[PDB]
């Protein structure tokens, strides 16, 4: 099950080692999720000085187990089910007319805190593009994450397109292709 | 007086049935405490094994003399002995499949004798019964009430389906990004709201059946008023192909209101 863990406020730790076009950086963040209301409160810090990429681009990368699942949909919650053991979240993000992120993360419980450790590698980004050129506005929009369960992985698949507002009035799209998978070996449900 | 039904009783059961054109026979032995509401049984498939369909539709057809009744509630089926009683049952499953049963309960040499005839019909080939996707029965409540000079009962019975997957749904997201004005490092403050949607109906985990049973005593004994019986059936064990199955049941009667 696992729902017992999320019945109340859960403290969160997130760590990211990124590499984008050779630019290396580390981001840490702390806060608390509430799965009952589906709320996240987090503060992130880059320890390497200036962030080579805009913060909004790291948002989707930086714990969907805190999503609120209505009572009738509770049996459909994959994320909470894998806990405390946790799950592996992999993504490939295609930035329109630009480079691509590739991430590997392990989301599990270390002690009483939920931990997400990410490894990100970007490539083929335009030096003057919206990402490396920091042309993206500081804000985020509303989205839909379409989840389909996939087969032999004993886990779920996902895709969606993130809309990043560019400061010139245009929109920078990011196509997300996501797949997850448990850690412990056995039934999930 | 408890001279007829003892505190511990054994029974023997025979079932001949046909489901989706598949004939078969089952013989089994059972035992329990009629006044405590508890019984067990071990069933064997003597013909037409292995069975192409789910065992769970057969399990409820293998014993109401074992129900625990309060003193103020007349036990109609216990009083029917030594002569005994018969029952007939119609199970209507949500996908159109139907199970019908006729049974005879007698008592010989201090042992109950059960004789069962069953038919399943119109079970869809991709349905959970023919696909063996059932996980067993949820706890049941049978509404009992006198009618037509007999004792009748009515159940809304939930069969648990094999867990498949998350299916298809989506997450709606909202996010605000802010800054800590006193924070001296490059940073992002974030607050996010996520809620799942895309499924209303709430039941993909269950296979429902409308059940109506009629219990007739062979002799004119005393009928109870309308009341309820709580029932829970468990499969305690079984082999791979379900040609050997052990069952357990607890049933206790209580007042309706």
Author numbering:
A (entry chain A): 3 to 64, 68 to 194
B (entry chain C): 4 to 65, 69 to 263
Paper quotes:
A modular strategy for protein crystallization using split green fluorescent protein (GFP) as a crystallization partner is demonstrated. In the present study, the protein chosen as a target for crystallization was superfolder Cherry (sfCherry), a version of red fluorescent protein engineered in our laboratory. sfCherry was chosen as a test protein so that the folding of the target could be monitored by red fluorescence while the GFP reconstitution could be monitored by green fluorescence. Our new folding-enhanced sfCherry contains six mutations: R36H, K92T, R125L, S147T, K162N and N196D. Also, previous studies on GFP have shown that it can form the basis for a complementation system: fragments composed of either β-strand 11 or a hairpin comprised of β-strands 10 and 11 can reassemble with truncated forms of GFP lacking these segments.
The crystal structure of the sfCherry-GFP(10–11) hairpin in complex with GFP(1–9) was determined at a resolution of 2.6 Å. Analysis of the complex shows that the reconstituted GFP is attached to the target protein (sfCherry) in a structurally ordered way. We concluded that insertion of the GFP hairpin at the permissive site Asp169/Gly170 of sfCherry was the better choice for folding of the target and subsequent binding to GFP(1–9). The crystal asymmetric unit contains two copies of the complex. With two complexes in the asymmetric unit, and two linking chain segments between the two protein components in each case, there are four linking polypeptide segments. All of these segments are well ordered and clearly visible in the final electron-density map. When the GFP components of the two independent complexes are spatially overlapped, the sfCherry components differ in the two cases by a rotation of only 9°. The relative orientation of the two components differs by 9° when the two complexes are compared. This appears essentially as a minor hinge motion through the two points of connection; twisting and rotation about the other orthogonal direction is evidently limited by the double connection. The GFP dimer interface is mediated through β-strand 10 (inserted in sfCherry) via the sequence Gln180, Ile182 and Leu183 and the loop Phe145, Asn146 and Ser147 connecting strand 6 and strand 7 of GFP(1–9). The crystal structure exhibits strong packing interactions in all three dimensions owing to the dimerization of the reconstituted GFP, the linkage between GFP and sfCherry (creating linkages in the xy plane) and the dimerization of sfCherry (creating linkages in the z direction).
